[PDB]
């Protein structure tokens, strides 16, 4: 009677749990799939921005890097919570707003450079995000984005979704933040280099070729997750992570995360206590409009605004289409939905995380039938759990989210059977968009190429039109 | 009446052009699509084996490299002709046997090394291919391959076909034998580096980022081919090649292939005459069973036999399924079909080209309805044209097959809508097989991973079975 008694309450009527009707047993932990799929962003986003180090400039690792990483974990777990809560409370829609994976490794590497090796610094790197979010507020306010959502052709919009999954899968295979399969080469570009004797500057090999102990633990974790997904276990994407993490927490093995180096007995010294708060102390703020006065920064606002407006608008509409909300070119709550995914970004600058991009992971939740609200709210409430448990989050080895990163791409492939492969006008664009995202290691190079090809081989109908 | 009068002839009854009936206008140049799609192998295969240089050892470029390249063009255009003719004359089936693209950049780089920098030389590199072809003769003779074809699960067999197209597309983007988009990097692995100021050792950039004149000519050639494929032009994959080649043949521009260097006015001195024969003089033979006596060579026969038997058997059956020949687990001519694609390889060693792999390009022909024979025979006869025209074949710039190489992968993607993406057992294997082929730059790493994953997450039903 939990559902029988909750209908006659303001939860039932505010969320409209009588029309488009679903059940709490189909909502409470049948929407945990979204959180268990988006959980990687707590550590993956905090690692990409850590090596950039937008704090404790040249004016090291044991003092500033660790503190910055711990500050960024909380900021990432809070900025996604705020965005998810906003989408759930108003404009009832089951989405998973969180800082995306398309601008993290564009700001941290191309803009600010590795470990501060760049011409643009933090005070003109977060200011760019804040200003572009303010621009998004205005653009969405008058309703331009609402009409612009339908202008993008369907196959480009779907190929972007497939390519994002492929890129997320590819980022989980490198040595930086993955298992460590792919590695560099001279004659070719990428080869299989799961080597035990690695050089701590690149993915090169000194002795190896598939005899590295760490690889044959992420493989086991990936197999457990895959075997648990069949038979329909309620939650398994965390089942394959805890098993690897618990083994890696054992001291003395060759796959440990707690070495005898002086850095190791500080992570281990922190991990001995389970619960800590660790309020943000060195990342909040850090907004300084001072170096805006040259053209170097300005060009890297133009190259970002019109790819972010075009690569994040088409994901919200796609996840609206998959859930079957839009029926006549419109879906309810569109005005508030397109403004929440600008208000979330502004709030983000202040804390120090990058843009929010309406995570394309709500497919997992929608597969189990999340139609009403009370789905983003549950995700947000779950996100107020990986900020009370920072010692158990910042201490997960990087060879534990790889199995959970490849499975994102595996899941985000069932939509490739909707693209029109019969035609030749409508298939070249989709293939180019799918292919250019992983091999160029940037999502910004996939939307632009697809738009440029689709716009080109139609101009004969435009000039004559 | 050309068809009305040819039915009452031994062509009509030997090829059975009354049952499974088709028409000559649907056969003669509605099967030219297969040749116009496989035409790249005349120059791409001759370039991969050229840098290996299995002739004129250290005991240079202007004398031995050019002669070896010209010798290999004829050998490649002849070995594919023999195989295609054999498949057409007996066991009527419309296929396109030719030396594959999976072993060329495994023998030339990993086995023999770059420019002879390896522990295995030519006389134990072609001998391996000859011996493995002799083994294929025996294996196919008693009928083991016929029963082994059906043992491979369907989704693995289809994901291999998709991944081969993806790998062929990826090989057309690098600096070596493609447009020149992708290039190396330090922090990441692959980036967009269409640069004008390239270093002639890698794909690095000194000045560039999409201002290289050569790139914005392969793009134009790709657009012409794409615009010609729509509207159903009889032949357009050669339309987009001749346009680029004719422009590149003009002397004095910055996109020429005839520089003022001493090497240039030897290619130009050859090109001044249109027709030449150039019988093979330095590649035929070169079989010496001498260095077989150590274990280094033996391991690189074992790592090749059981991936070649598993990655070439599943393509023949797949192209039999697409044409709708098999109806009860069997298709006519199976015994001769599985022996032709071993006899073709033996004949291949002697000339100096690598294994034959039943080119997966017959999809283009089958789309226009090639059901009977007289399709491989026409392809073979067309292959006795790019040996009477060597000066116009060896002088095509490498930035002209890139548009024709990416389109192979574009075409070989419509079969991805047959794979069962609904299940989770049957989709992880397909995604892994598709993904591991391009990013690892080897087809041998895709079949093995797919088989290893599919065999693993089914053993619970095997032990209990
Ligand atoms: C479009 C851009 C970033 C979007 N990134 C993402 N957009 C949507 N879903 C995701 N899941 C992980 N990363 C993402 C940058 O142009
Ligand atoms: C299976 C292997 C090579 C097969 N290569 C090819 N197999 C089938 N079709 C093709 N088209 C281009 N290359 C190929 C090596 O294991």
From Swiss-Prot, chains A, B:
Effect of disrupting the coding gene: Resistance to 8-azaadenine and 8-azaguanine, and, to a lower extent, to 5-fluorouracil, but not to other toxic nucleobase analogs. Deficiency in the uptake of adenine and guanine.
One GO BP: guanine transport
Keywords from the UniProt entry: Membrane, Transmembrane, Transmembrane helix, Transport
TM ranges: 30-50, 78-98, 124-144, 162-182, 210-230, 238-258, 297-317, 346-366, 373-393, 399-419, 426-446, 447-465
Pfam short name (any one): Xan_ur_permease
A molecular function (GO) term: purine nucleobase transmembrane transporter activity
Membrane topology: Multi-pass membrane protein
Superkingdom in the source lineage: Eukaryota
Subcellular localization, as worded in the UniProt entry: Membrane
One GO cellular component term noted in the UniProt record for this chain: membrane
InterPro entries the record matches: Azg-like, NCS2
Family in the record: Belongs to the nucleobase:cation symporter-2 (NCS2) (TC 2.A.40) family. Azg-like subfamily.
Function of the protein: Transports natural purines (adenine and guanine) as well as purine analogs. Confers sensitivity to 8-azaadenine and 8-azaguanine (8-azg).
UniProt-recorded name of the protein: Adenine/guanine permease AZG2
Protein source organism: Arabidopsis thaliana
Gene: AZG2
């Amino acid at each position: 009677h939990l559902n029988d008694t909750v209908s006659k309450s303001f939860i039932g009527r505010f969320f409209k749990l009588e029309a488009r009707k679903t059940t709490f047993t189909t909502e409470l932990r049948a929407a945990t799939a979204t959180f268990l799929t988006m959980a990687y962003i707590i550590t993956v986003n905090a690692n990409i921005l850590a090596d950039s180090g937008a704090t404790c400039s040249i004016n090291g690792y044991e003092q500033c890097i660790s503190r910055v990483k711990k500050d960024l974990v909380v900021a990432t777990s809070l900025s996604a919570m705020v965005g998810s809560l906003a989408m759930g409370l108003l404009a009832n829609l089951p989405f998973g707003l969180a800082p995306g994976m398309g601008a993290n490794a564009y700001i941290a590497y191309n803009v600010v450079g590795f470990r501060g090796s760049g011409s643009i610094s933090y005070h003109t790197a977060m200011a760019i995000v804040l200003l572009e979010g303010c621009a998004f507020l205005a653009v969405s306010a008058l309703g331009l984005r609402g009409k612009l959502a339908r202008l993008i052709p369907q196959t480009v919009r779907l190929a972007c979704a497939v390519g994002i999954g492929m890129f997320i899968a590819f980022v989980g295979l490198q040595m930086n933040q993955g298992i460590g399969l792919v590695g560099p080469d001279k004659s070719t570009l990428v080869t299989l280099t799961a080597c035990a004797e690695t050089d701590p500057v690149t993915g090169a090999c000194l002795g190896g070729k598939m005899k590295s102990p760490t690889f044959w633990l992420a493989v086991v974790g990936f197999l457990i997750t895959s075997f648990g997904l069949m038979k329909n276990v309620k939650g398994s994407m965390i089942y394959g992570i805890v098993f690897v993490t618990a083994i890696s927490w054992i001291r003395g093995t060759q796959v440990t995360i707690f070495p005898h180096t002086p850095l190791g007995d500080s992570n281990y010294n922190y991990f001995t206590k389970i619960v800590d708060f660790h309020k943000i102390q060195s990342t909040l703020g850090a907004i300084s409009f001072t170096e805006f006065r040259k053209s170097e920064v300005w060009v890297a606002f133009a190259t970002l605004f019109y790819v972010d407006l075009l690569g994040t608008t088409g994901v919200l509409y796609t996840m609206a289409e998959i859930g079957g909300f839009v029926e006549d070119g419109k879906f309810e709550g569109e005005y508030a939905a397109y403004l929440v995914d600008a208000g979330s970004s502004v709030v983000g600058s202040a804390l120090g995380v990058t843009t929010t991009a309406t995570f394309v992971e709500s497919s997992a939740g929608l597969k189990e039938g999340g139609k009403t609200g009370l789905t983003a709210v549950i995700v947000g409430l779950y996100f107020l759990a990986s900020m009370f448990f920072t010692p158990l989050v910042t201490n997960v080895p990087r060879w534990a989210v790889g199995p959970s990163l490849v499975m994102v791409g595996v899941m985000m492939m069932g939509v490739v059977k909707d693209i029109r492969w019969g035609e030749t006008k409508e298939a070249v664009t989709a293939f180019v968009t799918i292919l250019l995202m992983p091999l160029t290691y940037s999502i910004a190079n996939g939307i632009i190429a697809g738009i440029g090809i689709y716009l080109a081989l139609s101009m004969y109908d435009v000039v004559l039109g």
